[PDB]
């Protein structure tokens, strides 16, 4: 099934955060409307946040996270929840590797803000 | 029902980490085994990252957040999320006003670490 | 917070399931735009099907599911999880005593049906 | 990721129940042990519950759903929620087609009973 993929309710804004738990640097690209909006970049095995930055889902309200590692895309799992029908999370785990935590890099989309 | 209390494994390393979106200051209690282990606190209507720790579950594994505004605390909803049977993550979002956005303290719990 | 609410997509079909765990008769009445659109009872301590029904979220989406034991409201907890940016559920669960263990009457909606 | 598979405590009952929406008969294996415990079969577009049962999660609590359409195996999606600390959903998604509704056969497994 496609991972890391999420209809926002569109033109509005929305946090994305990410933190790194992996011996290798981790990049995690975040599209909006199929284009690049974010780019983090970091290595920690210690759960560091690699990036935090306030987006907005545009007319389309497709978000879409990536991760690689050294170029090479690492497996994606996802969901979204819903609390009080009212605050939303987007959730991404990825692995790079062949321990299956997927927490190499851990990216928390969350909205509404404000 | 109680909200904001979760059961981890014992003796596990997590990470938890507080964003701010409301004008109070918000002051954030994450407790280990019923005594506090980090209180973050801060303002923002912008999503910052108001607090970001690792810690140890501990002995009982029991963690729970609470949130005060204005000396009051906050109302609290929360979920408990595990993708792939691996990654889990403890959200907690917080009302301390009239508006029911819920995002006013957001936490957000995260295991396993390394 | 509120509980028991969800916004589905407006004019779409989903199916609501009820599962009873009490020695006390459940009732579960699931309303669309505050109207009552489905009524289950039942009685069980083995999480016996006490009904399921295909519904209408109508013009609103607003679906609400209340859980009464004899009249009198039980406590509810809820949320939304969204699976692979398409596949809904709405979750229930409900406490008509003291033990917490919120299996009382366990309500699951999903969507999309077909 | 590996989809469809959920740690439950061991030796714990637990309810797994599934519903059909497609043109394809849908064969529902949940395994206990890696072994079959139950196997729900039927066909609907319109969310009929092909089969319920109460298990036992058994020695390693381990409790793998898989789905098929004719012997062929369908992809999955998964993933597990807790509310207040204490309700249990594993819930699982499977799509046998080209729509990417996941909808085909849909299971939930939840605890605890009583
Ligand atoms: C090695 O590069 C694997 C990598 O880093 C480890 C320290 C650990 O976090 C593992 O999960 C990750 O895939
Ligand atoms: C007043 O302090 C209310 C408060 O701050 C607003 C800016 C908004 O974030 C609201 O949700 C929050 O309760
Ligand atoms: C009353 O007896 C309590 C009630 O029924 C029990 C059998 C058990 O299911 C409990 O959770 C429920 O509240
Ligand atoms: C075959 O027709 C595809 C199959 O059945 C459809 C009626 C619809 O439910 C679709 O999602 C499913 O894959
Ligand atoms: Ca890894
Ligand atoms: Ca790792
Ligand atoms: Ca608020
Ligand atoms: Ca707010
Ligand atoms: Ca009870
Ligand atoms: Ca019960
Ligand atoms: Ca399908
Ligand atoms: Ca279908």
Redesign the interface.
Known sequence: ???G???LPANTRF?V?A?A?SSGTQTVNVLVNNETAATFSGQS???A?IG?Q?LNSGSSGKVQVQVSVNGRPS?????????????N?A?V?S?DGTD????DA?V?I?????
């Open positions: 099934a496609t991972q993929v999420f209809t946090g955060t933190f738990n095995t210690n759960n946040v935090t306030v497996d994606l799992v996802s969901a979204q929840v819903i609390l009080t029908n009212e605050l999370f959730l785990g692995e299956n935590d997927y927490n851990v928390v969350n909205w509404p803000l404000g």
